[PDB]
Amino acid sequence: SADLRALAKHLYDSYIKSFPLTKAKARAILTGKDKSPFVIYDMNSLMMGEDKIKFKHIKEVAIRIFQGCQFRSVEAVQEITEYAKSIPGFVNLDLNDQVTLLKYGVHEIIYTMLASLMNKDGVLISEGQGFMTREFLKSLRKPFGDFMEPKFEFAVKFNALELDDSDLAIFIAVIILSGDRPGLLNVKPIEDIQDNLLQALELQLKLNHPESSQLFAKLLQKMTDLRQIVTEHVQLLQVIKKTEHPLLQEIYK
Amino acid sequence: LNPESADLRALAKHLYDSYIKSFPLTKAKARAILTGKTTDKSPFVIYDMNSLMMGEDKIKKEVAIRIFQGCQFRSVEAVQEITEYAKSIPGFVNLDLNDQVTLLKYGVHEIIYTMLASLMNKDGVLISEGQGFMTREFLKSLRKPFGDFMEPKFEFAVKFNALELDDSDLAIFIAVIILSGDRPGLLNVKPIEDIQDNLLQALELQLKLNHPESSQLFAKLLQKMTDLRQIVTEHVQLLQVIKKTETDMSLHPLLQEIYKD
Ligand SMILES: O=C(O)c1ccc(COc2ccccc2C=C2C(=O)c3ccccc3C2=O)cc1
Structure with missing residues (x-):
C-alpha cells in the first residue's frame, strides 16, 4: 500500500538534518528573497x-x-x-x-x-x-578551467526537471543503493532496498508533480550523464596530479 | 483497459511489428538456436x-x-x-x-x-x-588489441539478459534509445522529447503487463543505458588504438561517421 510515503517523509526529514543548505534555501539566495552573498x-x-x-x-x-x-x-x-x-x-x-x-x-x-x-x-x-561566477571558473588555466564547466552543463539540464528536496532525498538514496558497484559481496539486499526506494521515488514524483509525465523516467536517464560526469572528473583528477606536505595529501583521496 | 492505455498498446503493437520486419534474427529465434528448440537448426561452433x-x-x-x-x-x-x-x-x-x-x-x-x-x-x-x-574464450584468445573488444559486450549481455526481456519489450526500448534529446548538436529538442515521453509511457505499460511479477523492471531497464554508453566509450578508445596500430587496415565509411566522439 501507500506505506511508501512513510519512507518519503522519513528520508526527507533526515535530508533536512544531514544537509545544512537545502535546495529551497539555495534557490532563494540564487533568485532573491534576504541578506545577499559575496560575488x-x-x-x-x-x-x-x-x-x-x-x-x-x-x-x-x-x-x-x-x-x-x-x-x-x-x-x-x-x-x-x-x-x-x-x-x-x-x-x-x-x-x-x-x-x-x-x-x-x-x-x-x-x-x-x-x-x-x-x-x-x-x-x-x-x-x-x-x-563564484561561472565565467570566472572557465577563466582558469590549463586543466582547471574545464573541471567545473562540464558540471554547469549538467546542472542546467538537471535543474530543468525542477525537483525539490523531498524528491532529491529519495533520488540520492536510490544512488547510494546501486547494486552494480564493483566488489559487492551481497547484492540481493542492496537491490531489495533500492527497489523499495524506486517505488518511493515514483510515487513522490507523480504526487508532487502531476505536471510532468514520465518525470520518473527522465530522472533515471540523468544517472547516465551523472556517471559520465564522474568518469571524466577522475580523468581530470589524474592529469592534475600527473603535473603540479604528505599529511594534507593523506587527508584527501 | 482504457483509451489512455489502448493508445499506448496499439503503439506497442506497431513498434513490435516493424521490429519483426526490420530485423531478420529475433531474440526468440536466437534463444531457440542457443538453447536447442526443434523450431530451428543447430549452429556450427x-x-x-x-x-x-x-x-x-x-x-x-x-x-x-x-x-x-x-x-x-x-x-x-x-x-x-x-x-x-x-x-x-x-x-x-x-x-x-x-x-x-x-x-x-x-x-x-x-x-x-x-x-x-x-x-x-x-x-x-x-x-x-x-x-x-563463436565461443567467448576464443574471442579473448585473439591478438593483443583484438582480444579486448568483445568481452565487455559479454559482461553487459549476461547482466542485461537477466532482465529476461523478449522481443516485444526490446522493440519499444530500442525505440526510446534512438529518440533521445540529450545527443549533441540537436536543433529542435522539444519534438524529440515529446515522442520519447510517448515511447517511455508505452514501455512502462508494456513492461508492467508483460512482466507483472518483476518489481520495477522499468527503472532497472532504464539504468542499463549507463552500461551501454560506457561500452561505446570503451569501444571508441579501442578504435583509435587499432587505427594507429594497423595503419594498413581499413574501416568502413559508414561507421567512420559514427567515428567522431
Ligand atoms: O563475413 C565475414 O567474414 C564474417 C566474419 C566474422 C563475423 C563475426 O561477426 C559477427 C557476425 C554476426 C553477428 C555478430 C558478429 C560480431 C560482432 C562484433 O564483434 C561486434 C562488435 C561491435 C559491434 C557489433 C558487433 C558485431 O555484430 C561475421 C562475418
Whole structure:
C-alpha cells in the first residue's frame, strides 16, 4: 500500500538534518528573497573574498580554488555518510558493502547536490554566503578551467526537471543503493532496498508533480550523464596530479 | 483497459511489428538456436583456429584482423536495419533531417549492443544469421588489441539478459534509445522529447503487463543505458588504438561517421 510515503517523509526529514543548505534555501539566495552573498567574478574579487567570505581551507590562485573544492568534497562526504546511515536497511548490510556503496557513490551524490547550488551563471559557495561566477571558473588555466564547466552543463539540464528536496532525498538514496558497484559481496539486499526506494521515488514524483509525465523516467536517464560526469572528473583528477606536505595529501583521496 | 492505455498498446503493437520486419534474427529465434528448440537448426561452433577454417566450408590474411572486418560488415548491415526500423517510429521521419541523422549517429552503437545481447549467452555469441557460434574464450584468445573488444559486450549481455526481456519489450526500448534529446548538436529538442515521453509511457505499460511479477523492471531497464554508453566509450578508445596500430587496415565509411566522439 501507500506505506511508501512513510519512507518519503522519513528520508526527507533526515535530508533536512544531514544537509545544512537545502535546495529551497539555495534557490532563494540564487533568485532573491534576504541578506545577499559575496560575488567572485575575477582575480581581485577573489582576494577580497578570502577576507570577507568564510574560506577556512588555507600560493597560486587556480590551485587554491581546486583545493577549496576538495576541502568541501570531504565535508560533503561526511554529510552524505550520515544520511546513508539513516536509509532503512543500510546499516544492517555487510560493513564492507556499506564502504563500497559510499566509496563509489559519494561522487554521484556530490554533483547531484552541486546542481542545487548552481545557476546558469555561477555556483554558491561557503553555505550560500558566496557566489563564484561561472565565467570566472572557465577563466582558469590549463586543466582547471574545464573541471567545473562540464558540471554547469549538467546542472542546467538537471535543474530543468525542477525537483525539490523531498524528491532529491529519495533520488540520492536510490544512488547510494546501486547494486552494480564493483566488489559487492551481497547484492540481493542492496537491490531489495533500492527497489523499495524506486517505488518511493515514483510515487513522490507523480504526487508532487502531476505536471510532468514520465518525470520518473527522465530522472533515471540523468544517472547516465551523472556517471559520465564522474568518469571524466577522475580523468581530470589524474592529469592534475600527473603535473603540479604528505599529511594534507593523506587527508584527501 | 482504457483509451489512455489502448493508445499506448496499439503503439506497442506497431513498434513490435516493424521490429519483426526490420530485423531478420529475433531474440526468440536466437534463444531457440542457443538453447536447442526443434523450431530451428543447430549452429556450427567455433572455438579455435582449427574449427575456424571449417566454418568456411559450412558457413558463408591475418585471422585477428579477419574476425574484426567481418564484425564491421555485420555492424554496417545492422545500421541499415536500425535505420529501417527508425523510419517506422511514429514521428521520427517528421523531425528535422539533420536531427534525424544526429539521433542515428549516436544511436546505432547503443542499439547494436542491445541486440547483440540477444545473440549471446555466457559462453559465446551467435554469428552469420545464427548458422555459427563463436565461443567467448576464443574471442579473448585473439591478438593483443583484438582480444579486448568483445568481452565487455559479454559482461553487459549476461547482466542485461537477466532482465529476461523478449522481443516485444526490446522493440519499444530500442525505440526510446534512438529518440533521445540529450545527443549533441540537436536543433529542435522539444519534438524529440515529446515522442520519447510517448515511447517511455508505452514501455512502462508494456513492461508492467508483460512482466507483472518483476518489481520495477522499468527503472532497472532504464539504468542499463549507463552500461551501454560506457561500452561505446570503451569501444571508441579501442578504435583509435587499432587505427594507429594497423595503419594498413581499413574501416568502413559508414561507421567512420559514427567515428567522431
Ligand atoms: O563475413 C565475414 O567474414 C564474417 C566474419 C566474422 C563475423 C563475426 O561477426 C559477427 C557476425 C554476426 C553477428 C555478430 C558478429 C560480431 C560482432 C562484433 O564483434 C561486434 C562488435 C561491435 C559491434 C557489433 C558487433 C558485431 O555484430 C561475421 C562475418
